[PDB]
Amino acid sequence: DVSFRLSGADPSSYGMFIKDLRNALPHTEKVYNIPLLLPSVSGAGRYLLMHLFNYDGNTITVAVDVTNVYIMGYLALTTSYFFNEPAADLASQYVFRSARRKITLPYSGNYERLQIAAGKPREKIPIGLPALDTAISTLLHYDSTAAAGALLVLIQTTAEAARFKYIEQQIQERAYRDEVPSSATISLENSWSGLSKQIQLAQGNNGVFRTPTVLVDSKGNRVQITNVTSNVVTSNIQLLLNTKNI
Ligand SMILES: *[C@@H]1O[C@H](CO)[C@@H](O)[C@H](O)[C@H]1NC(C)=O
């Protein structure tokens, strides 16, 4: 399991959490020195538990699929909550079984559906450590519209930061003041599966992507990533989605 406490949190302690998160995800191989997530994992070992505590010390446990860093559901006191999607229903066979009741949220976990439920795109939702405290607090008691927004914050501040050093740094910058994600952050989130795939295809292609990935950079400028020498690959991406899952 990994844990993070908002009470007393700072950029260093959040960095320790994101490092713990990455280090809890199993891998057998690195591809261009980046851990390659597993094609599949059977049974309960598929799911990592993240214990998150709000500033007041209240807690939720979040279940994360270790093959793809997708959040499946969460436990809040004696109630479990899972996305309305088959992977989460399967997760519910293994985690949080001792919950007194199980609620299926009225959306799947992909960004498009969550944004629909929340009423707003994530361009417009501030993220940060204070936003993560709020999210944890929201998820403690069911409210499906509020929860959609909370879940967009939680996904970005945990899973997306684990995937991309740039996103981790963005959240660190927002340790004490929330701000909407940069356009680069959104671009990276949206590109993770594409990037993961092209980095793996590059292994037999002399480091060259079969298909270039278009990203927005730190200045709002739109670049084409064509090979493994790009800083996105050498510095930024921290985890690859196995091409067996793409
Ligand atoms: C590969 O990417 C580098 C660094 O981003 C770029 O300067 C270069 O022109 C590209 N080279 C090839 C062979 O695609």
**DSSP string covering 163-215, please?**
HBHHHHHHHHHTSSS-BPPPHHHHHHHHHHHHHHHHHHHGGGTTTEEEEEEEE
Nearest atom within ligand 1 for CA of residue 209: 14
- What are the start-end ranges of the H helices in the chain? 11-23, 86-91, 111-118, 129-139, 144-155, 161-163, 165-173, 183-201, 231
Portions of the chain given CATH number 3.40.420.10: 1-162
Distance of CA 200 to the CA centre of its chain: 20
Do the annotations mark residue 29 as ligand-binding?
A: no
12 lines ligand 1 (CB under 6 A): no
Residue 108 CA, ligand 1 centroid: distance in Å: 38
Residue 230 CA, ligand 1 centroid: distance in Å: 7
What Cα–Cα distance (Å) separates residue 219 from each residue in 156, 182, 215, 222? 20, 9, 11, 9
Distance CA 165, CA 222 (A): 19
Are the C-beta atoms of 153 and 147 separated by less than 8 Å?
no
Three-state DSSP state, 74:
strand
Do the annotations mark residue 112 as ligand-binding?
A: yes
- 11-23 and 165-173 helices cross at what angle (nearest 10)? 150
Residue 228 CA, ligand 1 centroid: distance in Å: 8
Portions of the chain given CATH number 4.10.470.10: 163-246
Annotated resolution, angstroms:
1.7
- Residues labelled catalytic: 160
Nearest CA to ligand 1 atom 4: 230
**Which technique was used to obtain these atomic coordinates?**
X-ray
Positive or negative, the CA dihedral 112, 115, 121, 126 is negative
Residue 245 CA, ligand 1 centroid: distance in Å: 27
Residues 6+ apart with CB under 8 A from 245: 37, 39, 40, 67, 68
Instruction: Tell me the fold of 163-246.
Output: Ricin (A Subunit), domain 2 (4.10.470)
> CATH homologous superfamily of domain 1-162?
Ricin (A subunit), domain 1 (3.40.420.10)
Do the annotations mark residue 100 as ligand-binding?
A: no
On the 0-12 / 13-18 / 19+ scale of CB atoms within 10 A, 197 is buried
Alpha carbon distance, N-terminus to C-terminus of the chain = 26
194: phi then psi, degrees, rounded to nearest 5: -55, -50
Q: Which two tokens stand for residue 178?
A: 């929330």
Are the C-beta atoms of 11 and 21 separated by less than 8 Å?
no
Nearest CA to ligand 1 atom 1: 227
Distance of CA 74 to the CA centre of its chain: 14
Distance CA 89, CA 72 (A): 8
Nearest atom within ligand 1 for CA of residue 208: 14
